[PDB]
């Protein structure tokens, strides 16, 4: 009889194709079965979509569209490889986000849009493409770290969302610690902002996460800084400059709101 509904039409068509012919293309098989599952589980579409739904006032429409365009420009940079022009685009794109008023008034919207994951992914791309070979494009990494720290300071929920990425950041702690004029702009600083002044997050912080920092500090206390001795600094066996940053992070992990987290 009459289907009269796109749902029933698709549910009939996928099954008809599958029963008519043996599909050779695995991508086609996935496509048809994804469509069939979507038709049958209609409520699941709402379950997935509603968390991504946001309502804004009519007066904020233009500012929200500008911020959405900026976020799209930042997102498109994932598809391209890191370069000078991409660094400039990323920098002024982040600048527009800070300047926009919607960024502060609607932190839940930004967390739902998942800007911090995108900035993280760009930083991961850079550290993969130039961590061991000394941090290339350091300015954009610094800007990303500053943006992420400001994201932590905007709202307490954003702080938890950022703390959920602590494990990677602690593994990329040794990015630009020994290089001054970049203080407050390394992934270790971002981790400190993630676990700064939040009792819940400090308690939730695990022992292996502290163990990573302790191991880094042990390495810095045992061996000198290769980049400094390359610049020609007198070679003392240990590294104070890198060690101090890890000490600061440990301080922020152990001490919170004037109280000392005993655990």
């Amino acid at each position: 009889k009459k289907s009269s509904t796109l749902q029933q039409l698709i549910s009939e068509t996928m099954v008809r194709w599958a029963q008519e012919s043996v599909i050779e293309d695995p991508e086609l098989v996935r496509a048809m079965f994804v469509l069939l599952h979507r038709q049958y589980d209609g409520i699941g579409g709402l379950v997935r979509a509603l968390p991504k739904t946001y309502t804004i006032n009519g007066v904020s429409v233009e500012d929200t569209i500008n911020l959405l365009a900026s976020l799209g420009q930042i997102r498109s940079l994932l598809s391209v490889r890191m370069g000078k022009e991409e660094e400039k685009l990323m920098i002024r794109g982040l600048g527009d986000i800070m300047n926009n008023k919607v960024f502060y008034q609607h932190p839940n919207l930004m967390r739902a849009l998942g800007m911090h994951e995108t900035v993280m992914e760009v930083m991961v791309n850079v550290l993969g493409g130039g961590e061991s070979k000394e941090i290339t494009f350091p300015k954009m990494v610094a800007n990303c770290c500053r943006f992420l720290c400001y994201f932590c300071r905007i709202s307490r929920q954003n702080q938890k969302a950022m703390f959920d990425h602590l494990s990677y950041l602690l593994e990329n702690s040794s990015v630009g610690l020994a290089s001054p004029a970049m203080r407050g702009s390394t992934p270790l600083d971002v981790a400190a902002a993630s676990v700064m002044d939040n009792n819940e997050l400090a308690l939730a912080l695990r022992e292996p996460d502290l163990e990573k920092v302790v191991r880094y500090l042990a390495g810095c206390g045992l061996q000198s800084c290769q980049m400094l001795v390359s610049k020609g600094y007198p070679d003392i066996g240990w590294n104070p400059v890198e060690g101090e940053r890890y000490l600061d992070f440990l301080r922020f992990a152990v001490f919170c709101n004037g109280e000392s987290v005993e655990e």
Partner: protein, 434 residues
């Protein structure tokens, strides 16, 4: 051998190396498509493990050393002169097998293709040689496809060398595919490589095939078959006119074509010679036709700007008068009665001439052939006879397409074989000698 030892003293296992290279190629041969999925996956896993073990024992650098030490000899003749005639015979085969082995060792293995980054620069340095071009290209393609890290070392020099490979070795889609892989790898676009490839390949317009829209151009001529010959009852001077009732400068994005003049036929065949039957060509686009467009004299697809009072491209209500003198080869034009200040001279006269107009869409021209058929507005120059006077007594003067085929239903379309020569057009009396 390079240290100049005697061939007898030198132990050169040519046949053993060739057979071992064949066995290694068979060993690293990729799985076939007919195989079932599970078996294909098993073969793929086995090949991956073999490649891993080989590269961990450092079999890639050994192949590279063999290839490098073999390239010192310029050619098979040179290698034969150095070592021996079997060595010269098998030198190219050994190089090709070595390159194939390297490609098989690094294909589909990201770790190996990443370790090959250091040698990539040395690899591209021998791409110019015909002894190794195909193998080096295949190895480069495999590395670029497999390893993202490979792209980060490709600089302007390497891209320029790859592009110059097209200019030196001719068109080859494999170089194009390598250039494409240099643009986007694993869903990531390298903008620097994109810009370099664009700016180094596209602007030249000398390697890639070029495309353009060309307006269809048709040619129209009367029946008359003016000609010149010794001892032939034909009059050497001729004259006709064409008036453009209407013409649109731009019917389409391209400029409208409208040219008028004379065309010749190769030999005495009635078929016009030297030009395409259909296409964008017309009067003056070949060395058998002679045209005028109001500003340019056209011949051999070459246009020369010719001066005239009130210069303009052929417009509405323009009368062009064409004069032909075969006694001294001369084609002259006069626009609206004013004389055009250029003329064709000393053209080949071993053929039959006829008036012709070439055009694209948007013309309303009218042939004024003189006399009863057309009425000349400007009187012919002295001597020149109007073109209608060359019609044979039986035949009738009509304007028909220069070429055989025309727009009509396919099943009605007449297919014509070669035409017979029209030597009878020139009546040269041949009396029996007495």
């Amino acid at each position: 051998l390079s240290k100049k030892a005697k061939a007898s003293t030198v132990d050169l296992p040519i046949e053993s190396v060739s057979l071992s290279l064949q066995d290694l190629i068979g060993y690293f041969h990729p799985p076939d498509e007919h195989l079932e999925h599970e078996d294909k996956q098993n073969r793929l896993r086995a090949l991956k493990n073999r490649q891993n073990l080989f590269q961990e024992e450092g079999m890639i650098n050994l192949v590279l050393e063999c290839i490098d030490r073999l390239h010192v000899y310029s050619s098979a003749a040179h290698f034969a002169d150095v070592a021996g005639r079997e060595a010269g015979e098998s030198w190219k085969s050994i190089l090709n097998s070595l390159y194939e082995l390297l490609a098989a060792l690094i294909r589909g293995n990201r770790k190996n293709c990443a370790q090959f980054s250091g040698s990539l620069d040395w690899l591209i340095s021998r791409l110019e040689r015909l002894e190794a071009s195909s193998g080096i290209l295949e190895v480069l393609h495999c590395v670029l496809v497999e390893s993202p890290e490979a792209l980060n070392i490709i600089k302007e020099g390497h891209i320029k060398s790859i592009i110059s490979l097209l200019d030196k070795h001719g068109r080859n889609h494999k170089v194009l595919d390598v250039l494409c892989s240099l643009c986007v790898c694993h869903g990531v676009a390298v903008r620097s490589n994109q810009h370099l490839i664009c700016d180094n390949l596209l602007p030249g317009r000398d390697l890639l095939l070029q495309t353009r829209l060309v307006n269809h151009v048709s040619s129209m001529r009367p029946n008359i078959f003016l000609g010149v010959s010794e001892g032939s009852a034909q009059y050497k001077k001729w004259y006709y006119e064409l008036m453009v009732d209407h013409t649109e400068p731009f019917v389409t994005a391209e400029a409208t074509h409208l040219r008028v003049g004379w065309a010749s036929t190769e030999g005495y065949s009635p078929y016009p010679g030297g030009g395409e039957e259909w296409g964008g060509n017309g009067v003056g686009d070949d060395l058998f036709s002679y045209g005028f467009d109001g500003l340019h004299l056209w011949s051999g697809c070459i246009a020369r700007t010719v001066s005239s009072p009130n210069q303009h491209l052929l417009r509405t209500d323009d009368v062009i008068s064409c004069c032909l003198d075969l006694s001294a080869p001369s084609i002259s034009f006069r626009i609206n009665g004013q004389p055009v200040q250029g003329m064709f001279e000393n053209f080949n006269i071993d053929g039959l001439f006829f008036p012709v107009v070439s055009f694209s869409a948007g013309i309303k021209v009218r042939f004024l052939l003189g006399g009863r058929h057309g009425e000349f507005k400007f009187l012919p120059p002295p001597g020149y006879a109007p073109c209608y006077e060359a019609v044979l007594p039986k035949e009738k003067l009509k304007v028909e397409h220069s070429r055989e085929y025309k727009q009509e239903r396919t099943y009605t379309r007449d297919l014509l074989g070669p035409t017979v020569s029209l030597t009878q057009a020139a009546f040269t009396p041949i009396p029996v000698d007495t």
